[PDB]
Nucleic acid binder design. Sequence first.
DNA 1: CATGATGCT
DNA 2: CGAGCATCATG
Length: 579
Amino acid sequence: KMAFTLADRVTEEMLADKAALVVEVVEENYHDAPIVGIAVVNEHGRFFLRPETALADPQFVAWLGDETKKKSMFDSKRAAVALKWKGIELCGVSFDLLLAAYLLDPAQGVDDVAAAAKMKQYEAVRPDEAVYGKGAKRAVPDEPVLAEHLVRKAAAIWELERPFLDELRRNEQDRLLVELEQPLSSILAEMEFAGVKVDTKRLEQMGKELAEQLGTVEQRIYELAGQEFNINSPKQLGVILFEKLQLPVLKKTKTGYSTSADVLEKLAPYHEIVENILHYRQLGKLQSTYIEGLLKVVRPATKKVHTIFNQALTQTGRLSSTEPNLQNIPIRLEEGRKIRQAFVPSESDWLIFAADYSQIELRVLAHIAEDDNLMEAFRRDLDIHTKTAMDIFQVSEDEVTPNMRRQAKAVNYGIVYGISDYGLAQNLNISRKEAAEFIERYFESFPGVKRYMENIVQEAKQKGYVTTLLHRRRYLPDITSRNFNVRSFAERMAMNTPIQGSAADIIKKAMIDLNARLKEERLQAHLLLQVHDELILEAPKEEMERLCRLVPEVMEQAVTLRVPLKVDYHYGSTWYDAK
DNA sequence: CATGATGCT
DNA sequence: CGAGCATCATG
Ligand SMILES: Cc1cn([C@H]2C[C@H](O)[C@@H](COP(=O)(O)OP(=O)(O)OP(=O)(O)O)O2)c(=O)[nH]c1=O
Ligand SMILES: OC[C@H]1O[C@@](CO)(O[C@H]2O[C@H](CO)[C@@H](O)[C@H](O)[C@H]2O)[C@@H](O)[C@@H]1O
């Protein structure tokens, strides 16, 4: 039983200076999506409004946009962006229950009010799936059922704010919410709604050229196999490789024969079909994901793509990007990297500006490990891969080969992920004995890294969780498991999550500090994309010289560690050219 | 919906 | 038997 007014006009008592507010968008992708209902709960009552009415009401719209009128919400960014598509500004969000729940425990996967409510045993609200249905059954119910659901969501947010802020304070996460995550949500909403302009003619032309070149490679594969088959089917490719061609079976997957990139590398000495298959797959990814996917989702009249940054998903505090994912555009191979030529500035006489932290996770490892050898390399800006090579191969600087540096780089990032000697041997295609020596030599060279790995596992066992620089937490109950595989994966999380997560906290703080400085100076430059350790902007060409100073300095100053942060930056006419 | 491939940080 | 992700075609 919950009393509410199904209102047919806006009243002053709905425009209080503290309220919980629901602006319901049912479509998972909320860009230009319908708003299906509005609810407001405040000290005066509980109200459902039809959006045709509220959003055409001058005083409701002014209330939405008034910073001083404070709103508690769940997934404020989804409402902010859906309102921006309706030309309505939402301001004054002072509590976001989605981000509060995420900070309390990202492993709960909270993605609706009822899941956040479960954290406090609050039962007076149903799950969105119970009301809307799943999958093909998804639908807005009849008004009275809809209005009840949205009012119970707003009433849950109203009641839950205090309990969640108190727990956040106990976990030292109250500033993490209010000074970091909530202001970042507003920034992301602006980046998503601005979108990134795409040169669809270039994409369509690359799609033409790739369709030709896939057909060439496909045919050569069939020639070498002496049979036509589905190169993307594991069953069919495994029959050709391992039964027709009689190659050795190096690894199995749960359902058959592995054809992983590392397996295929090991098979390449046996048959020329193996290099061709690796090539086809690379081309197939460019066509199926990047070319065909971007062209599907670009808005044709503006040529913009509008991704969604999920702020409340990863276990370490990173963002993720979806529909489309703009954080995995190709770079490594030149064929794919040219996709970046299609990412252009949204106005004439504008340029793309890309700035990236240089080796942030290795700098963070040096800070948190307090390892004297490591921190000195960064404090003196010495090439850390060369430094590691000189240690794992034991040679002077001049004796380090191109190949030695490659191996030492693999060791340096491997350590950050908890690599075993087995993994290092597979990655490098070298003797496991040798791999083990490399790791042993690393820990002898960087003994504070070894101490940190022992100490953080112990801390996880004693406290039940590990933390990052700005006090994000990840719980690791498997750290005590009797199963070797389960325990070992938890220990690698304990080692890695403070690294990866503290790097995520640093670039999020940079984004907030950068947006402040751009606004201070009244620059037209603004953020387009974040790619984990990089920020991509666009700006009038005339703003370039200012951004060359301002962007790296804000990024580098975002926090102060036991080593410097270092930012590299590039600009040009397309994202490809910003190298 | 699951699988195992690809892409990025 | 190296951390965190999204996407695709196929099963
Ligand atoms: C190899 C590797 C790179 N990266 C990321 C970090 C960098 O932002 C990005 C590009 O890596 P690189 O530029 O290849 O690495 P680096 O900056 O250490 O190398 P170099 O000294 O040779 O210039 O990829 C990972 O996150 N994990 C990895 O295992
Ligand atoms: O709105 C982003 C925000 O919503 C959640 C659900 O609370 O995720 C939904 O929307 C995403 C963006 O389209 C989808 O990818 C996802 O499938 C859907 O559940 C939160 O996870 C997210 O932070």
